[PDB]
Write a protein that binds this ligand. Structure first.
Ligand code: HEM
Ligand SMILES: [Mg+2]
Ligand SMILES: [Mg+2]
Ligand SMILES: [Mg+2]
Ligand SMILES: [Mg+2]
Length: 380
């Protein structure tokens, strides 16, 4: 009951089976393993995200370090909002260039054969990095992600993770010193116009981390749930203007980012239980997006739901909390919509009569960020 742990293999197997017992029965669940509380109720979670004075979180220029173990937001957001119209042909090519090898076979794994690389490549365009280097970059990003997400690492993984983030610095740092004097129109160049080299590397790195994982996760998650609800897929195929709805419901239904940490600046009460200073709470987004106080039939994937509030699903005043909520809302919400919309449409254009593979076994993994282990599809 309160004896159960949200860091367990058991929980990590299927977080969705325990959210309900978590609200209603132990909403502000203490995690003995750390000095961290886990908050499962929608309205609590949302109050926490709306009030980042009481519940602070790291700056964009703060080098990330393992989650388990304020004016630039706009400068990023806008110069990401100005970016997306420019990067749409490049996102489109990436999708086409990366699908290209797999057509003809009529067989792909949208996660491992395509997704990861696609997202990596879109971010590399956002940062103006040379897409020849996408193998190195992916491997490096992954090693770092591994260090941030993980509960624990072996000395090897940790030694690899250190290496990866060493390599990235060796790679990006010369690009930063270059663009300071010869800036293109890419994000790195823009950041050089009022922060230090190392500051900018941190921001760049946090934008590398932020903009990659969730985007490939969502693509795969949406396609999977559309295929798992095939008339909703047909709905989307016959009217492509539903893709924002399919995207939004996927985000509500299986948020790629499951946990949003916040540090407590003071003593304060969320719900009923009292929590002391400097302790860190964890917003359980999965649990909040499945809360029947916010959504009706919450455990039903329905792209046509009336309370989705599609009108706003890709903003800070949204109904689901997959981008967070309010002032500290995902900086690339507008970007994320476009990116996924584009690629989805191409995936759907090129993979005619797309379906799941014979004897494919769906499986999610992740505690802090969660998505499919793979998505084995077949098509003409
Ligand atoms: C599938 C779509 C995406 C989802 C669900 C998502 C989710 C999130 C969430 C939950 C946060 C936490 C905000 C908070 O602390 O309350 C966040 C932060 C952030 N997001 Fe996103 N994201 C997505 C795509 C993107 C993309 C494509 C970009 C960049 C274009 C982006 C840029 C950022 C940045 C820069 C942060 C700040 C984190 C930091 O301080 O390092 N996101 N995102
Ligand atoms: Mg080591
Ligand atoms: Mg389903
Ligand atoms: Mg159906
Ligand atoms: Mg499932």
């Amino acid at each position: 009951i309160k004896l159960f742990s949200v860091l367990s293999d058991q929980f990590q197997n299927n977080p969705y089976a325990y959210f309900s017992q978590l609200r209603e029965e132990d909403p502000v669940h203490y995690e003995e393993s750390i000095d961290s509380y886990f908050i499962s109720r929608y309205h609590d979670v949302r109050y926490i995200l709306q009030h980042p004075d009481i519940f602070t979180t790291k700056s964009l220029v703060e080098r990330a370090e393992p989650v388990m173990r304020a004016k630039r937001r706009i400068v990023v957001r806008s110069f990401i909002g100005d970016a997306l119209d420019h990067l749409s042909p490049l996102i489109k090519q990436n999708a086409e260039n990366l699908l290209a090898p797999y057509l003809e076979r009529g067989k792909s794994d949208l996660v491992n054969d395509f997704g990861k690389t696609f997202a990596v490549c879109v971010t590399m365009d956002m940062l103006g990095l040379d897409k020849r280097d996408h193998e190195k970059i992916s491997e490096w990003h992954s090693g770092v992600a591994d260090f941030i997400t993980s509960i624990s690492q072996s000395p090897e993984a940790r030694a690899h993770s250190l290496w990866c983030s060493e390599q990235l610095s060796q790679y990006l740092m010369p690009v930063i010193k270059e663009r300071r004097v010869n800036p293109g129109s890419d994000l790195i160049s823009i950041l050089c116009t009022a922060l230090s080299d190392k500051d900018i590397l941190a921001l760049i790195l946090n934008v590398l981390l932020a903009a990659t994982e969730p985007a490939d996760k969502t693509l795969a998650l949406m396609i999977y749930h559309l295929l798992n609800n095939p008339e909703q897929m047909n709905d989307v195929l016959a009217d492509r203007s539903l893709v924002p709805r399919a995207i939004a419901e996927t985000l509500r239904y299986k948020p790629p980012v499951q946990l949003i940490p916040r540090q407590l600046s003071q003593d304060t009460v969320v719900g009923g239980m009292e929590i002391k200073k400097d302790t860190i709470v964890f917003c359980m987004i999965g649990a909040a997006n499945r809360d029947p106080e916010a959504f009706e039939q919450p455990d039903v994937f329905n792209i046509h739901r009336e309370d989705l509030g599609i009108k706003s699903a890709f903003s800070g005043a949204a109904r689901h909390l997959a981008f967070g909520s309010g002032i500290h809302n995902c900086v690339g919400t507008a970007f994320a919509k476009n990116e996924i919309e584009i690629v989805a449409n191409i995936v759907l254009d090129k993979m005619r009569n797309i379906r799941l593979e014979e004897d494919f076994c769906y499986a999610e993994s992740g505690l802090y960020t969660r998505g499919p282990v793979s998505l084995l599809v077949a098509f003409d």
